[PDB]
Design a protein around this ligand. Structure first.
Ligand SMILES: O=C(O)C(CF)OP(=O)(O)O
Ligand SMILES: O=C(O)C(CF)OP(=O)(O)O
Ligand SMILES: O=C(O)C(CF)OP(=O)(O)O
Ligand SMILES: O=C(O)C(CF)OP(=O)(O)O
Lengths: 272, 272, 272, 272
């Protein structure tokens, strides 16, 4: 049993290879800000030796009001990424919500994404199936890990066969998430050992971001999917929970001494 | 504290009024079948004295494969309802999945609906907001009842102020649903005592359909939302779980001796 | 398939027979109080026509401090019941925590009981097995209903074969209970259709006591197990949640129009 | 904020110190076997440089039948440990179920223990309070981590102030456990930073023993609490889930490269 590869460009994403960080930012507030954000990761990434992918959203179809900030917009959002790629030389992972946005973003970026809440939207997956560009299937809170196969199959059946599975904890009572650490493994199986990643800042909806991201790494994953803001305290709105920018590096050393020190272990078996 | 009314035509839906059945069928297989289905309810309804609304889907955006039956289609689906209304004189409740389908169905039917998985899709709610036609907000399995206000507010903010809340149990471990009977009440509150209904066949994903629908009724609801098939055993596919048609009537007597015998109780208070 | 009977004296407890209330009080504060409590039930019981059993604890092995009120004590507690039986002519259901208390209480009362937390204490069940006096197995929050057989078997194997199963909801996240209404049925099965009862005030750990106890009754049970205090608001300590004494009667009319109106239904089957 | 120490003899148990393994075996089948078990740990422990404590039960008050193996017995069980201590020079951690067994075991062993199911048994804790010998509070599946203070307080109030908290996952639906990795931290707090340990073989009720024990270590704990059997496959009965003896060492290297490589990290803060 070997691991699978859904490599994006010069990058190879696989459970036995070193972890690839799909960090970044939540919503695209403004290039002035964005870029500054895309700036630290890159520096810390290259400086620490960790594959990178920048993430940012150009739209928030979901919120608690219409009289709020949708986002940069699909048309005005794609552009914004452009200016970024060239400037820094990193890929762009963003999420789609309409069968239209499908192809566009396919040209503008590298790693597209499927929102959890839509993981079971035939029409939209049969459309993302076209692009043939790497896909990220965020795992819905209300869905058992062993159900990740059907979603992966359907992607195959549509033409695309390069998919990734991101974990964001699972419902635990009302208004609460807990990350079954045994999930990741069960998820490897049903998808054909496809790439598995942990969306930590999202499994938290805190000082916990560290300790909680540490555990997931010591199990062996194809990487993380994080978010950080320069001033978390104030921008402190809702949805996920971002990281304290400055603390990016010292935090990322925590992972390597894991993502490396564990991605090079002599396969064990507490089975037989 | 009085109850609210989101009456559809000659029908009044409210927590203190008798229960209104939003029964029907899942997907629209064929008028030959549909109608036969729409036939028994109507007979049993009128014969037993229970308000009625027929439900049927014209599309299943969600499934486990593209190489399967989407459904009658929006354009070819709406028509099918037409032929029904006149023939029997009952309203039509169906669900939408696209901001387009919004207005169309608004003319063709009476009770439109919001799928759970989309309960938090701004754009699509701001669109359903237009129609101004009664709305049904299926409560997502992964969402606490006290969160039903924001969804109800947003509907107001968009213009529509006639909304209903349907309950379908809440996640309990992996691959399992349990219906918090205390939900219904908590749901009345946050929405401004809006109409609350139980989607039983869906809270089950069995001989349990009865016993489980009984409990919900003895708490006092603005009604149920059921489904039945003439040959459940064979058509035994997945998604919800339908009822055994024939058993419609004797089953519905179970509710009345509740929906009535409890909808006429001297308000109690185990509070003070 | 017929129901089983674990009748205590002139009382017959069974799922198809009318519900038997095992109400009463939590801890035995004082006869002056106790009795007053035992007074209203009895009056309302006889006045409404509902079998009765009074419940009260003579010890609270579990609490949040040693420097607190253990309880009347086993030796000084048993006596207290005596004075009650004669005065009112109702049985006494109390819980045990030691293999010693086993036999004593067996002579002093009618319905002994097994605490949930101990449902799996061999030695203590093999001891309660002796008494041969009716037993009540409170169902632990952390145990699936289908596991209630083993506990019932062991009771048989020990000699006793008259056991009852009380339901108190099941863990739902941290610090929260939800009552799977489908539990009761699943519990009937594995125990050999033994008697099933709902411990409502305990499934709540409120104005909810009513609405929540209504649901359970409309499913058909061998009765309830409640608690009420004359001044809930103040005595408002913790553990279960008692009922507002005065409100006993008007509340109990709610049940009959259910426990009766449903205990006389023409067996249905949404199965075939 | 410094960590606390509840050191047993020449051993110091604390969250910031290296992890201490409280491994061993479940029930005491026989010295012939026991010892052989106590043999590998010791060898691997000393050989790998990891503090050790051997665990084994001398009684199983809980089971699924009386006509089964209780265990060596308290009187005949204590003795068995004796012969072990001298032979190998390691401490003995065993669990108690009666206020009597309290003091005895206090002389015979080093680390006594509180069973989860009894974590809230006043009388028995007020008794374990006497011994003044280190205590292990297994955290009940049905109890939130933030509730671990009251249990720790009561232990203080009784005289003993050297307590440890062992985590064994928390209920997740029916018949299932999931380990909230964020638990450990929350548990440190409420107990006064007391010692926290993970009971992995018990959080599993498999090949998962490894991956799952890895996560817990990368969060930083005062150690583990494991169990292994020479022939797991056959002795494959129930209760916890043991480890494959032989695989003890290569498995324990997994922990050190964590328990060490993380117990020597520059305190981070994703907080501010
Ligand atoms: O919103 C979320 O919480 C997650 C994951 F947790 O992703 P998505 O935006 O695709 O639903
Ligand atoms: O699919 C379901 O289970 C429910 C409710 F349970 O409704 P919807 O089709 O809107 O998600
Ligand atoms: O304490 C409880 O909550 C219940 C039931 F919920 O009974 P017991 O005292 O036997 O554990
Ligand atoms: O039995 C168990 O599962 C655990 C812990 F999971 O310990 P205890 O024997 O004290 O209840």
């Amino acid at each position: 049993m070997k691991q699978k590869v859904v490599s994006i460009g010069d990058i190879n994403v696989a459970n036995d290879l070193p972890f690839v960080l799909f960090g970044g930012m939540n919503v695209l507030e403004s290039r002035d800000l964005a870029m500054r954000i895309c700036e630290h990761y890159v520096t810390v990434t290259q400086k620490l030796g960790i594959p990178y992918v920048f993430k940012a959203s150009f739209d928030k179809a979901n919120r608690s009001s219409i009289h709020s900030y949708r986002g940069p917009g699909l048309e005005e959002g794609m552009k914004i990424f452009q200016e970024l790629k060239q400037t820094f030389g990193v890929k762009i992972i963003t999420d789609v919500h309409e069968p239209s946005q499908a192809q566009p973003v396919a040209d503008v970026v590298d790693v597209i994404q499927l929102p959890a809440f839509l993981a079971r939207q035939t029409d939209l997956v049969e459309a993302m199936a076209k692009t043939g560009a790497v896909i990220n299937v965020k795992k819905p809170q209300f869905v058992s890990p062993g159900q990740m196969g059907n979603i992966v199959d359907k992607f195959k059946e549509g033409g695309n066969e390069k998919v990734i599975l991101c974990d964001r904890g699972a419902n635990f009572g009302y208004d609460n998430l807990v990350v079954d650490m045994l999930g990741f493994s069960i998820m490897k199986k049903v998808s054909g050992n496809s790439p598995v990643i942990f969306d930590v800042t999202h499994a938290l909806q805190r000082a916990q971001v560290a300790e909680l991201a540490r555990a997931g790494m010591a199990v062996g994953l194809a990487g993380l999917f994080i978010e950080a803001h320069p001033d978390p305290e104030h921008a402190k709105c809702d949805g996920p929970s971002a990281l304290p920018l400055a603390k990016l590096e010292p935090f990322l050393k925590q992972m390597k001494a894991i993502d490396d020190l564990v991605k090079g272990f002599e396969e064990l078996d507490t089975s037989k």
